[PDB]
Structure to design on (505 residues):
């Protein structure tokens, strides 16, 4: 089992062509809706299906069968992305293909910078057989713009874009530490395309670059891909009744 | 649950104890009877801990379990293990040790030695040892100074450049932001510069413990490093000779 070493999911993400990736928030989207959506993501040619949320409760009982339902609807890898909690580490269920592990390098709390990784691995393998564990995508996770919700929960401070001083320290770490991916997110604003370009230029060729937050149009997805993003994530745009139209436009 | 990666009794002792020299016993070179004699003297000198460390090791578990037990029966000081990790295994460990010092080699060109060894070690935990009996882990930034192809070939390290403070300032930002417990400045063939020790002491938080070692063979050197801000000054080789009692008295007196 690869665990923290590169595996099948990371290989797929590295080799697939860049594009949009829909993120289903499993604690807001009913499982029947997730299944309907998952069937469409496959036809569009997305690289993976992310299940992600800032908030979660009764994770294992909700997510094991949620992941199973989604996996019965799409052959794409199902990747989980959730924040860790002291005393538990990151949440995990059998059946997920991978867990995206965010090292929040901009956080003022060392547990969220990386000690959560130590707690998670200490607890491994736990209740899930070693051979059945998801792979781990080690990721540098950075936040942009005013965001007191993530700041209060995880201790993050928005990355300064007044100069490249802070981001260059994060690129040195991403490279020296051999992170698999970088995830640039903005809860309330937009990650600047020029920051995406700076990261693409500074990262190694096998490091995968995700950008998400308030992406709601195909124009935005194109602009981020043109700026160097490997994957452009979007959740909220499809959390409405007319999601099929929205999905077509964003993926068009 | 064992503290493991969280601060525990050993880190508290290192943070609160008076700064001073710390003798490092290489257990794969020093006979256990001699280690036991040495441990008794270290206790009399009031050192903060006894470190057992080596770059080289084989048959770790069968050798170290009884070695650690012998040393523990001879001193009440915490016994801390410090050895490099090996891919496929992570860091070596035996029951009975009070703590393992875990070096994150931030200057290595190999990400396994920069930090993934930590992930492998914790993934393997608890393994063959009962959770409640596991040693505490001291998360440490480990940096190397001076020409050192042995560590370079083994662990991927590149000597820290001191022609500017750019490289060490980057390590200090990591040490602080990642909440490392300790920083270990080592020179296999030269001497860590006292001015680098001062830069690290001024740049670290008050609870971060600063160790310096490598080629310390005199009390004058220990004093200079302590004056520069080191919390502990390690020395192994100076006592690897017959007249070690005189050498110890000069380094500690
Ligand atoms: C802070 C961080 C990067 C990681 C820590 C773990 C953490 C909080 C994981 C949850 C996923 C996340 C970063 C944001 C939630 O929604 C956005 C889609 O935004 P939109 O609805 O605007 O499309 C997404 O899933 O990307
Ligand atoms: C490179 C590094 C810092 C950590 C990786 C793990 C690693 C190689 C651990 C072994 C311990 C070590 C750093 C050096 C060996 O001897 C000196 C004392 O030298 P002296 O005989 O000159 O007194 C010591 O133990 O400190
Ligand atoms: Mg949510
Ligand atoms: Mg474990």
């Amino acid at each position: 089992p690869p665990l923290w070493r590169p595996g099948r999911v990371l290989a797929r993400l590295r080799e697939h062509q860049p594009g949009p990736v829909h993120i289903i928030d499993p604690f807001k989207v009913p499982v029947t809706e997730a299944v309907e959506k998952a069937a469409e993501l496959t036809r569009l040619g997305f690289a993976a299906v992310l299940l992600a949320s800032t908030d979660y409760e009764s994770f294992e009982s909700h997510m094991e069968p949620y992941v199973a339902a989604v996996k019965a609807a799409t052959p794409l890898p199902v990747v989980l992305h959730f924040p860790p909690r002291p005393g538990a580490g990151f949440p995990v269920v059998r059946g997920a293909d991978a867990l995206l592990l965010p090292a929040l390098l901009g956080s003022g709390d060392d547990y969220f910078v990386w000690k959560s990784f130590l707690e998670t691995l200490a607890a491994f393998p736990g209740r899930i057989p070693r051979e059945e564990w998801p792979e781990l995508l080690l990721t540098v996770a950075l936040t942009f713009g005013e965001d007191p919700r993530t700041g209060d929960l995880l201790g993050t401070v928005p990355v300064s874009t007044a100069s490249t001083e802070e981001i260059d320290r994060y690129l040195h770490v991403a490279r020296a530490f051999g992170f698999h991916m970088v995830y640039l997110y903005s809860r309330n604003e937009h990650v600047p395309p020029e920051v995406v370009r700076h990261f693409r230029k500074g990262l190694g060729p096998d490091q995968v670059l995700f950008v998400s937050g308030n992406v709601r149009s195909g124009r935005q997805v194109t602009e981020y891909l043109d700026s160097g993003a490997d994957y452009v994530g979007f959740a909220g745009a499809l959390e409405q009744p007319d999601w099929r139209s929205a999905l077509a436009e964003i993926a068009g």
